[PDB]
Amino acid sequence: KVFGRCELAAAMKRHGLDNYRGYSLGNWVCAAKFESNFNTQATNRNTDGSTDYGILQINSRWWCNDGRTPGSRNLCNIPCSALLSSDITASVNCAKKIVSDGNGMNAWVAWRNRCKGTDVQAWIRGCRL
Numbered sequence: 001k002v003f004g005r006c007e008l009a010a011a012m013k014r015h016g017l018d019n020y021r022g023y024s025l026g027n028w029v030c031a032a033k034f035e036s037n038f039n040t041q042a043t044n045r046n047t048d049g050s051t052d053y054g055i056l057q058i059n060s061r062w063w064c065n066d067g068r069t070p071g072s073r074n075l076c077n078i079p080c081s082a083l084l085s086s087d088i089t090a091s092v093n094c095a096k097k098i099v100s101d102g103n104g105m106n107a108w109v110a111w112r113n114r115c116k117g118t119d120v121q122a123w124i125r126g127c128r129l
C-alpha cells in the first residue's frame with residue numbers, strides 16, 4: 001500500500017505514535033517519507049546482508065525475523081513480512097520499541113540526516129487530524 005501523506009499521519013495517530021517518546025507526528029511522517037516514500041512494501045538489502053522492511057524500513061539485524069540474517073535477533077517478535085502489511089500496526093508497535101531503545105529517532109539514519117531539526121510540522125500541515 002502507498003499511503004498519502006495525510007492518510008498516513010492519520011493512521012500513525014490512530015495507532016498512538018503521535019508524540020510517542022516526545023516525537024511529534026511530523027517527525028514520524030517525515031521519517032516514513034524518506035525511508036519508504038510511504039510504501040508499506042518497501043524493502044532494502046544492506047551490505048551486511050540484513051534487510052530493511054516496510055513504511056519505516058525496520059531492520060532484520062535486531063528487530064524482526066526473516067530467516068536470512070545470520071546472528072540476528074527478533075526483538076519485536078514478528079516476522080519481517082508483517083512489516084510489509086497494508087495495516088501498519090506491526091510497524092508502529094515495533095517502531096515504539098526501537099525509539100525507546102536509547103537513541104530516540106536517531107535509530108533511523110534517514111530521519112537524522114533529512115528530518116532532524118527541520119520544519120517537520122510541514123509533513124502534517126493541512127491534514128484533518
Ligand SMILES: [Cl-]
Nearest residue numbers: 004005033038
Ligand atoms: Cl508527500
Ligand SMILES: [Cl-]
Nearest residue numbers: 024026120121
Ligand atoms: Cl509535527
Ligand SMILES: [Cl-]
Nearest residue numbers: 064065073074
Ligand atoms: Cl525468531
Ligand SMILES: [Cl-]
Nearest residue numbers: 067068069070
Ligand atoms: Cl535470521
Ligand SMILES: [Cl-]
Nearest residue numbers: 065078079080
Ligand atoms: Cl518469524
Ligand SMILES: [Cl-]
Nearest residue numbers: 011086087088
Ligand atoms: Cl493502518
Ligand SMILES: [Cl-]
Nearest residue numbers: 021103104105
Ligand atoms: Cl529522544
Ligand SMILES: [Pt+2]
Nearest residue numbers: 014015087089
Ligand atoms: Pt488498528
